[PDB]
Subunit: 458 residues, 3 copies
Amino acid sequence: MNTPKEEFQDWPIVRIAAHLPDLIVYGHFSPERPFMDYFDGVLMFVDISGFTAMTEKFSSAMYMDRGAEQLVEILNYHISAIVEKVLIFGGDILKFAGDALLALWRVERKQLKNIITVVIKCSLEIHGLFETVKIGLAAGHISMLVFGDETHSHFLVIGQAVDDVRLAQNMAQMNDVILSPNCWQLCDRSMIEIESVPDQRAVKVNFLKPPPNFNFDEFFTKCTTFMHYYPSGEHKNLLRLACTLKPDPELEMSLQKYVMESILKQIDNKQLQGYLSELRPVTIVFVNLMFEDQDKAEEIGPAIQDAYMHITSVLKIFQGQINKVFMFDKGCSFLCVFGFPGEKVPDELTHALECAMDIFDFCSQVHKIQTVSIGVASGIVFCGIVGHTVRHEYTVIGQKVNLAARMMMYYPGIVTCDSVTYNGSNLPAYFFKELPKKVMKGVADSGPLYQYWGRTEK
Amino acid sequence: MNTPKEEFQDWPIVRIAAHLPDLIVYGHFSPERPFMDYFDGVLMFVDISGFTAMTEKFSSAMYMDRGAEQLVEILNYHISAIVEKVLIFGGDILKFAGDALLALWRVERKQLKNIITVVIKCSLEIHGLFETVKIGLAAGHISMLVFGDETHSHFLVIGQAVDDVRLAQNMAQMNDVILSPNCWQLCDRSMIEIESVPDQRAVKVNFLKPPPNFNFDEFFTKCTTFMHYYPSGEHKNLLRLACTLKPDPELEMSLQKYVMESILKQIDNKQLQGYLSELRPVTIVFVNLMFEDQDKAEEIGPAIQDAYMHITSVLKIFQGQINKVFMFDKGCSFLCVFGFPGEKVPDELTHALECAMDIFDFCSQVHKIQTVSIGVASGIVFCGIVGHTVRHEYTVIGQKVNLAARMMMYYPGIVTCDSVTYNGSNLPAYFFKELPKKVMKGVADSGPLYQYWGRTEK
Amino acid sequence: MNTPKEEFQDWPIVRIAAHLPDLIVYGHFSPERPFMDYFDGVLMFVDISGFTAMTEKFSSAMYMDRGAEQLVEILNYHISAIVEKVLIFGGDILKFAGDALLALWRVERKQLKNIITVVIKCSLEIHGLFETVKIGLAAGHISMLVFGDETHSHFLVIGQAVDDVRLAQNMAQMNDVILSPNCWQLCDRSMIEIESVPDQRAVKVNFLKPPPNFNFDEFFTKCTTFMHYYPSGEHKNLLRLACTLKPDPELEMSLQKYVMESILKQIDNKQLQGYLSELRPVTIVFVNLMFEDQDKAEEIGPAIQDAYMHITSVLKIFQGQINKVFMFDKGCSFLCVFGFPGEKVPDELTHALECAMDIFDFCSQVHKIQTVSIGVASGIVFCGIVGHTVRHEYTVIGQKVNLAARMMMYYPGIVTCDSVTYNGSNLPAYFFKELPKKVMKGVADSGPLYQYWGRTEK
Ligand SMILES: O=S(=O)(O)c1cc(N=C=S)ccc1/C=C/c1ccc(N=C=S)cc1S(=O)(=O)O
Ligand SMILES: O=S(=O)(O)c1cc(N=C=S)ccc1/C=C/c1ccc(N=C=S)cc1S(=O)(=O)O
Ligand SMILES: O=S(=O)(O)c1cc(N=C=S)ccc1/C=C/c1ccc(N=C=S)cc1S(=O)(=O)O
Ligand SMILES: O=S(=O)(O)c1cc(N=C=S)ccc1/C=C/c1ccc(N=C=S)cc1S(=O)(=O)O
Ligand SMILES: O=S(=O)(O)c1cc(N=C=S)ccc1/C=C/c1ccc(N=C=S)cc1S(=O)(=O)O
Ligand SMILES: O=S(=O)(O)c1cc(N=C=S)ccc1/C=C/c1ccc(N=C=S)cc1S(=O)(=O)O
Ligand SMILES: O=S(=O)(O)c1cc(N=C=S)ccc1/C=C/c1ccc(N=C=S)cc1S(=O)(=O)O
Ligand SMILES: O=S(=O)(O)c1cc(N=C=S)ccc1/C=C/c1ccc(N=C=S)cc1S(=O)(=O)O
Ligand SMILES: O=S(=O)(O)c1cc(N=C=S)ccc1/C=C/c1ccc(N=C=S)cc1S(=O)(=O)O
């Protein structure tokens, strides 16, 4: 009696799971929105910095109209390798943004010290890939927030460790691994040699220096006791346990709400795989919400949910889409896009400004939101699915994405727009205020920037 | 000198062979139509009963417009596992219908007793998959009929064993394996413990109870002597020998006639794989032909061929399609569909009724056809490719499919239609007769049913 | 710590490399056009002769409108096997044309003798595949020419060995391996038993007859010392080293210029794989350029580049495409096609004739081009990607392709066209001269042929 090979099955549920972290795939949340959960862990924020900045080059004539295809190929070649390192070291990739990613090792509180050592070694092996990247590490309390409606879901992680991992990675020169102050407090100081970072309490990792009897592979194996989903036994050859997910209509209904409809169309073999990689004209509306205390999920959770319900309603009317939601050092940020896969309708610009204003007015009156700031910028951006075969997400990358992000942070409390938007809108000039030029870290040649004042003086 | 791996090649001939049983793939029939062949074997009819009945749920809003995709994923997850069991135990899947399938073990007459034991063990392992299905078995003489024209072919199996395997499976409660009377007569009674089935000569299998020296794997190996196409030797790792078919234009011309054109388009990589899975509005015309003796191929074969030639001509004019032909307990049944893949033209309904009537009038005068009955029903049905990667077929599933089937059996001798068809047609009311309501085993809430009387009183 | 399998990655750069020989993939040429390089090697020209001639049959009704699909399946089944033999024996497939291919073993001059023995054994194993094909071999000096513009590149090999390998294969009856005179001069005469070929200095291989101590596998291993890209070590399981190419935007920009845009669309998953296999009406314009000395790259290179710049400009205006460039026994030949993938515009014929004439007038005044001859023929041709998964090219095959080729050689110095072109053009009759009928080796039933005289008497 024959025994044919049990082969890998790429069911639709597995294809959906590649877009999501274990944090969501293996969650089992209540239905209320917002939903909040509390835990401890180590976070790694890795950035292939400088990439977005150079992406303008893939529009150049030398790429012969295959710039998008070449960009996603070269980006994925490098990002995939980082992803695979994270996964083999037992981490969960939470989110991709631009040319950056955020990873989590969730563990019981008593094990933070040893897991920090695992994450440090991972980081150093990540740098080792590129000898021929900047990394920030944080550790401590983390909260999860899940928000959405009956057909869409989004998640965020929040708290001091999340705020920290950002600060840490901003400080890294190239090739550094930086630890947050709390990460450095909690870590196995006997193992790692560090330097001070001038005017900072964070530190830099110089070397990992294990004791005589130390064997990293045996240490790692011990650490796996505490990793719930590390592929093992019969499945030790897989990068993710999620590769083994079986059809389950209830679970697939829950997971599909996290993925955009155009991605699902691809998943369902109803659209060619190449259709979503493109260098496409869009308008970015980057919405930032600031709170008095952004580390307290129970305070900020309802407010984010309320803002989301309104944003999604305003976006719906124009086929805008939320591409991502991230925490920033200051606030919760919604990266919204007008002009995505087959959503290309006329007056994208006037509508984008009116949408922004509507969001601004509504969110300004939401209980607990202290400040709303919105940046609007328009031009050619890369859109595509970035990451590894087993862990990837649809992402937008471009100078206009980062300009919209920087505008909302450098011009808080108002709706701002770039010159393409201002000129294109053909709204009358007195709907705007021409703004002073600010030097914006990460940006140059911004062109004139404007505030969208609105239809009336007020 | 290198020796690179001989890799599996998915040639178009192999892709076509996945839609067909070994009975056809390895046949070598004459060109006459009808063609008839005679043999002996064991038949297994397996039904995941209740599924079709629940399929209405995949149209519900909770599935967020991916009902078809979720339905085919979950159905195939379960059906695939049954298919793989059948194939490993040496059976040939003949046909899929709805959430049911028919399998055959063809063997020389002297080996029926031992092959029944193999099929019994298979059936029990099939039930074992679902601890967390109903099976009927028959054995004896079987005839094959192949009918068609110069560009299309269809096959049927016929005879008392085929009639029996239906009766047997109708009697099974859930989780039963039922044997036909002849199967029970021919089987190894020392091996199997059975109960009587009240008011039936068929029996139910309680257990397989082998003797002391018995070793099922060694018994199975012996049985493989008699299985012409059991994958073996170098190919013992394959589910089907048909996976090894090589390009052969003559054979591919013959096999392609059994597959619908839209499936071939997919096979040829000229249509996306996802296009054929859909929850689509169609009109089912289910045609039943009854004979004085439906076990005699030489009598019924020419009549079925004659009926087929006319049906196919009438269907052609409106882009109706034959989806399947099955034997029923009473008669040969053609499952015809209007509105399939890209065949969506207006007045589907009036045309469907006129087509039905034309078929009714013509088939009624075919020598040897005793009664024609036709059921017409219209609404949302699932269409898609069901089964395993290596053995699958395009199938339609839905409450309207089963309503059309039950109408043709409970209202014999006339053309009947459902309320959607009647109301939609906007043919005048006196073209119809409103019918008494019958309780139809397998159905509820049918709505009013009508006879299509036709254009004249008569 | 897990170690998941390093799996084969089908990056876009690798997909592009399948369309190209190692000669180009691993080249590192200067940017000037023309570019010329000089080396030594053995050439194998293999033809599955008679195939093109029978291809008319795949339009017959018996193929039920899947003639193109069946043709490419059966052709690739056989061609793939030849390709795999060439690759395992260490050769580089340079080009596919019709049902023929050209392969090269490049080696240092001192090793020609031993490499000829390897190529002879390969050829005999190729014949061994088909017991149930004609091969010509040449050896000696070879020049490479690369020509093109800023966005397209083409290459040719040139010289006496290239002229020889053609002569050699023209002489082969079926099943022969013929050696050129120089190949026979350079080979290991102690190993091979040959016959004279009447009225020729080339010879035919009867047998390979190695000495007592000879072990072909050990001899082959020795020969691999001299094969730069033979897959080895960790990669000994691969057919080509090019399967291991990593993303490299500079290299991909260079390689993509050799591939047509519609093929790149497929590569990029932006068009279905099946779209390019078709039996399609086109017009072939086959352009032949003759030189006083076609073995001297430094003479003919600039002239071919000049002709190319003009051809490509004339083709551009009508969406004609260069499908291939080959050396012929006499001259350089450009196989140009009007009506390719989505390039189907009206008056294909008048435009094709005017294009031809423009090319004729311009190329006639290019320094060093002695004679220009152009054949124009129109009808149904097969287009598709022919070869192996790892080494394949887009090719056109058909009686009209070979008619255009034979016209340009049998009616040198003029633009000729077939009856379909002449009649279809509805240009006035005095734009043409009706030609005497020539018996053209490889052709019958040509229909009347015409010269395109042009708009004026002159
Ligand atoms: O029955 S429903 O389709 O409405 C359904 C609603 C749910 N709502 C929520 S929350 C969660 C699940 C769910 C259906 C599950 C199945 C539907 C069809 C199957 N068919 C087969 S073969 C098997 C399953 S199973 O997952 O229960 O095995
Ligand atoms: O590529 S694999 O089969 O290994 C695979 C592993 C995953 N592992 C996990 S967790 C998740 C997905 C996955 C395959 C994805 C696709 C494979 C073929 C497609 N053709 C089309 S359209 C589209 C997709 S899609 O999901 O990326 O859209
Ligand atoms: O653009 S980044 O790759 O740095 C990025 C990745 C994220 N996630 C992932 S995966 C989340 C946020 C994020 C960008 C953050 C900022 C963007 C603009 C700012 N302007 C000012 S002043 C400040 C910040 S901050 O949050 O870093 O303080
Ligand atoms: O020659 S025909 O295309 O008309 C033909 C008619 C048949 N009618 C019937 S019944 C059955 C087969 C058939 C053609 C077979 C081939 C056609 C092309 C091949 N080319 C190559 S390389 C090889 C074969 S083979 O199968 O004979 O090897
Ligand atoms: O999936 S496998 O390559 O193992 C395979 C085994 C079979 N074994 C046997 S017997 C038959 C078919 C088969 C593959 C089928 C497809 C693979 C990719 C496709 N892409 C598209 S459009 C479409 C098909 S199709 O044939 O299902 O249409
Ligand atoms: O619908 S089923 O899954 O039971 C089915 C599968 C088949 N094949 C496969 S694979 C072939 C037939 C078939 C349905 C048969 C009937 C459908 C309606 C009837 N109404 C009455 S009275 C009686 C029968 S019967 O033939 O079972 O007597
Ligand atoms: O920077 S450009 O895009 O203009 C460029 C021009 C060339 N012109 C020529 S000749 C050759 C290469 C080339 C760009 C190379 C890269 C572009 C983006 C990368 N991103 C990441 S992660 C990595 C590379 S790499 O190959 O240099 O590693
Ligand atoms: O098929 S393999 O993945 O082994 C492969 C090996 C190669 N080896 C080398 S060197 C080059 C290419 C190659 C795969 C090609 C494709 C695979 C899937 C496609 N789907 C679509 S559209 C399209 C292509 S394509 O490149 O042929 O267009
Ligand atoms: O058509 S073929 O398969 O023989 C062919 C394959 C090639 N390449 C590849 S891969 C390159 C050329 C080629 C055809 C050459 C000719 C075509 C028509 C001729 N008419 C006359 S007189 C003479 C020649 S010749 O060059 O063989 O003398």
